[PDB]
Amino acid sequence: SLKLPNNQVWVTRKASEWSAKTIDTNDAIPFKTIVEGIPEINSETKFYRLLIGFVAVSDGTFGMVDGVIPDPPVVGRLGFKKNTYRSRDFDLGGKLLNQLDDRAIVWCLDERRRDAKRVQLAGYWIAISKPAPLMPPEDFLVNQ
Amino acid sequence: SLKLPNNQVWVTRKASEWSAKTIDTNDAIPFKTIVEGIPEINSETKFYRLLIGFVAVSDGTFGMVDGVIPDPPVVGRLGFKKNTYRSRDFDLGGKLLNQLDDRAIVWCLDERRRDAKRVQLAGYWIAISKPAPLMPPEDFLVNQ
DSSP states (O other): OOOOOTTEEEEEEOOOOOOOOSSOOOEEEEHHHHHTTOTTOOTTOEEEEEEEEEEESSOEEEEEEOOOOOOOOOTTOEEEOTTOOEEEEEEEEEEEHHHHTTOEEEEEESSOTTOTTSEEEOOEEEEEEOOOOOOOOTTTTTTO | OOOOOTTEEEEEEOOOOOOOOSSOOOEEEEHHHHHTTOTTOOTTOEEEEEEEEEEESSOEEEEEEOOOOOOOOOTTOEEEOTTOOEEEEEEEEEEEHHHHTTOEEEEEESSOTTOTTSEEEOOEEEEEEOOOOOOOOTTTTTTO
């Protein structure tokens, strides 16, 4: 279930640590942010899976939402427990970025809702359509 | 000269825009910073080439230094002209990160030494030893 078809690859990037907060709100990470800073990705990339893993300092619930101040998730909402690794594979359906750029993952904590590192995320893993071999642009070494 | 041997690949990442500055100093980007946030890279990676490209708002000089408040570069120092793309391929010698982590690229501008975007960098391109196919860790989907 970490194996891919031959026309897809895994890409990843490091997740930021969460700072303490002063407002009362939902914690949400938008999909466009998850993808920012991954060079294999462009307007033609199709997206098949997003894997997330985390540990939280409280019980709570989480899931993916489509509206985006994002609502708590309804369909597919799942629970987690304090200090227990939780993970989730989200199916992205072979869609392009412009079709997923309204999505976010949202967490609702029972307690310690404003603490620093209240959720600690592993790297994000995304299965995408396999890119051509990476190469600098042809005009990179002009005036070298 | 953008082609690699079969046991190397290109990796890249986006460069940050430069803010205006209030101090009088050299502009330097350390090698450890260039490499931060590239998942294919670890303690065993060997480094073969670093490609940089930039446009500056003034004439000046630049080059790679080994001491690192880094000195202006001596050996291999090169000139550039205002509003003219310049690029450079630096040979990294097949070395590991711990052998390159004292290196930086340093720019010395003739004029406008404190302006925002005084140097605008293209993505950094690095030729490294070819990694195994990227895969999430085996324990990623515990408690899914």
